[model samples]
Target: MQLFDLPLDQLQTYKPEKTAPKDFSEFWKLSLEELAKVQAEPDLQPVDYPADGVKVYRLTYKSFGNARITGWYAVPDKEGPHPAIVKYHGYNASYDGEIHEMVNWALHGYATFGMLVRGQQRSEDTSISPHGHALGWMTKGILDKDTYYYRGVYLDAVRALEVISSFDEVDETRIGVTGGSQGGGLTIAAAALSDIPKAAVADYPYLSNFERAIDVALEQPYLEINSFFRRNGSPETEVQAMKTLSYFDIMNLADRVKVPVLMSIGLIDKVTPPSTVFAAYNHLETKKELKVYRYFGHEYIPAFQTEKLAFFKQILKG
Candidate 1:
């Protein structure tokens, strides 16, 4: 990875004109209102994890389209009301390895809820037949705005906020969202679409600036889009797909985020290009900071993890 993205100076100043669909607001308005009607029932089961001072649960909740989403929820064994976090995982993070990292936040006094997107991991869903790219969820149901996969995924992130807020052990007013890659993308989208999350930590999030991401990323997850068109997509499908993506794009949604956001980018990253990350970052109209790692390329920054802990500790005040 030899500096695969935009130049540093241009990236720092880059904020492309928004590509939001004309019906973007109305589309999400109706989508959110529909999810609002579903009464979320928290179905929590104890998970056997040997962690001191933290209790973990196998968390399940109702999401949009009557889907049952599953993941882990963790809280301090002793607590009245604690600051909460909704943790979204990277592309196939939990499904592939079955690692439960969401519980890591509970040790630090957070009531954390992390959900696997419907149909991934143990989440069971018999609805909405997936009919696209064989590699992953990226191109699944991508042709139409109403049937796009991220539409439901974004709603599930919002549903997580509602589920965590319902728990008596959580302080609803002090919730934050965090994730990297896909999780990072959902972190921003969830905060943008909901009033529940008060702070956000997104690290080189994907699902940002569709036109640029697909153009720049030569990796598996983003390249899946290009591969889809190679198999069954056409010129018309490509145009419609980009339009559908615009509604769920973080670059379009980031401006609506009301919370204080702390974001980071790997300057040479190609998976979610530095330009795409900045595209979303520059659009934030609230308190926001961007941390850049010049030598990193779509990889974890250990130092950011330390800063993230401090950032949330200060904002959430636990």
Candidate 2:
């Protein structure tokens, strides 16, 4: 796994310009505001799953169009406004064994809330049509910004931040968000779309720098788009898809992010290319730091997970 993206010298400064829609900011602004008008009915029901020291509950709330989305919230048994984190997971991934992770976080004195992106985790809404132009989610509703799958997913993540912060056992002022892959992308989205998170950590995020990702990456998430272009798409079709995708690109949203951000990248990762993460990193106009794992590819890094724990400990535990 030698450097496949960029040499370290070039990577620190690599920031390729990305395409964005004319109404990129306007579209997100209106959608977020409209979402604000919809009252969130946050409900927390205790779950008897392996009843451990940390209490776990199935947290349900509404988002775009008042669709009910569920997440798991775990609180420390000894709690008094403990710092909280809102987490998102990888693309089309499950929350199996995630409750255990939340238990670990509770042990670390953190209350954890996890969001299952709409139509994911075996809880898909039947009302939404599976009408993307391609095989995976990247192209779902690819033709229009309003109907794009991520539009709702991003909004749902932000709503999750709101719901978690409302609990009396959570210290709202110390809220943070984190995730890897799709979660990393959602962490940036939540931090960008709202001001709830005081700090952010995104590890090898997807849905970023699509202009370059389509050409560089050799994996499923990015490869899905490549297939879309090679198979059924025409030159004109790609043009329209890129325009719709601009509104969701993390780079376009990075500038508006106000909280401190800590992003990590596996230098040899082919899934979420190293340069793509940097593209958004350079665009961020806030206090930020980055961790580069030189030998790593796309999988989990235990060392970085420790670093993540320490980063949040310093920010939220103080």
Candidate 3:
């Protein structure tokens, strides 16, 4: 009934062991080989919708089993060939006002696209809980590595990159990705998997070093695991499930990333916890910058972090 009833030291002190695959290149080669094996028959159709001044459309992209996953797509009115970005949404939030506020990237002459996650609003299925995916989409078939939950979302994100790059006004070579919380986790994942994106802005990211997250942070997102374990009432099975879930852990994927990174963390953010972000940063294999907010939670404070826009302009607009 309570939230995060786990050992504090185990939760907060968790850090990933960087035992990268023997041949890191071969690992991705095999990973992508496996990804390619899963066919993605994405059906991208337009929707006559607009969120504020942004021009919105629907994207019926493919995931595992060729599932028809729908999402929102938007672009700036700029002329041909602009830099592109695929934005993912935070947990329990829709991609409505979120996109409009972030349209400044498009306004500044870049092509911007926001992807509505599979179970989010107006998506293919709202019945499936967002909590379910975060905990372990992979754990369902933990016995098998191929049919994992992250396998779907991660590929779905890659499909988003594929669709956005096809636009006439978007530059396929100069693409980027970003998001906060769960969205932030997706941003990190996309950056790891694709080198097309030159840079990334990961904000208070979740889904990294899961072992520590469940133990340290007493919040809804991390607590989702504890709740599941409490209900299941099998410590042995739960620990095994946790090990299987680590296969998709973000920190483990860090070495694959090859780009400059902009990461921000709030010291007081119980939802994401600061140490986990540090663990991610410490393992990152690229030029990086970190921004820490002393008195903030998960939400962004544009007034305070105006420098971030300048940072993006410097890295992405060039």
Candidate 4:
């Protein structure tokens, strides 16, 4: 089925406000203003963490709200200014072990940095004091757009880009972002909103086209909204809940991206749903490409999509 067949109008509509100063020079200038304030000057100290012959370093720096976000930086046992890949982790996992999939970029002579999402293990570096997302982060401070959970996460993602590109050992000009599921969404957001990444790889991303996702995507992350409504005993508030989430909708934000992008879709994937991925992908105004995992579900699987990843690495790093 085509993505347009999805009932997207039923989902919440979003309208972005001008949050940037008028004097901003380029696309990323607005974001750079705040990013500069919270800039985490990574000390770039090397650690002894080793995994499968890859040299790893624990890079620590403050990301969201002056909280430290730690990332595992792996190099191909090579030289300085290597092409860098900023990898964002999917939900329900932490930044642990030497990730072969991510370190693949490093093996190809690129510096790879994988960020740990908040509320997961290694998230202690910076977490809200009243940390609670069982009600869904979209509703957290839902009363105001300024205090939404995405603001922090987006800030963290942008900070990750800033931290990685700032490193002398990383080729700032060749920096790229990649991740799957929620991480894919974050990568898109970082590349689109930050204007820093040279390119992005969004693999079966979640949290795109928020309106269509609620009805069609059969997944836990999307169901969190339904669960919230059920728990509150207020089905009528579903529209309001979706409206609250619209602010962070990836579809609306994708148009802001200036870098090249490669988005993947799993035709049979229920987690993110093929339609939702296409909605956001279609909206992106960048030099873009989309790969269809014809008979696959959410798990694109390492072996199956290596060529796709290589495609991104070549464009962004070459």
Residues 46-159 of candidate 4 have per-residue lDDT tens digits of: 766445556777777776567677767788776676878888877664546335655566777778888876655474434343423445454554433445566667778888
- Pairs with backbone N, CA or C atoms under 3 Å apart (clashes), candidate 3: 11-215, 11-216, 137-149, 138-149
- Whole-model lDDT for model 4 versus the true structure? 0.69
lDDT of 1: 0.85
- Ranking of all predicted structures according to TM-score, beginning with the best and ending with the worst: 1, 2, 4, 3
Per-candidate TM-score against the hidden true structure: 0.95, 0.95, 0.81, 0.82
State each candidate's clash count: 0, 0, 4, 3
Model 1 scores a TM of 0.95
The residue-by-residue lDDT of candidate 3 on 160-275, one tens digit each, is 78767766777887787888888888888888887667778888887787777778786766776676676566677576557656656778777678988888876677788777
| Ranking according to lDDT, highest score first | 1, 2, 4, 3
Off by over 4 Å in 1: 95-100
What's the TM for model 2? 0.95
> How good is model 3 by TM-score?
0.81
The stretch of ten residues in a row with the least summed lDDT in candidate 1 is 95-104
State each model's CA lDDT, in order.
0.85, 0.84, 0.66, 0.69
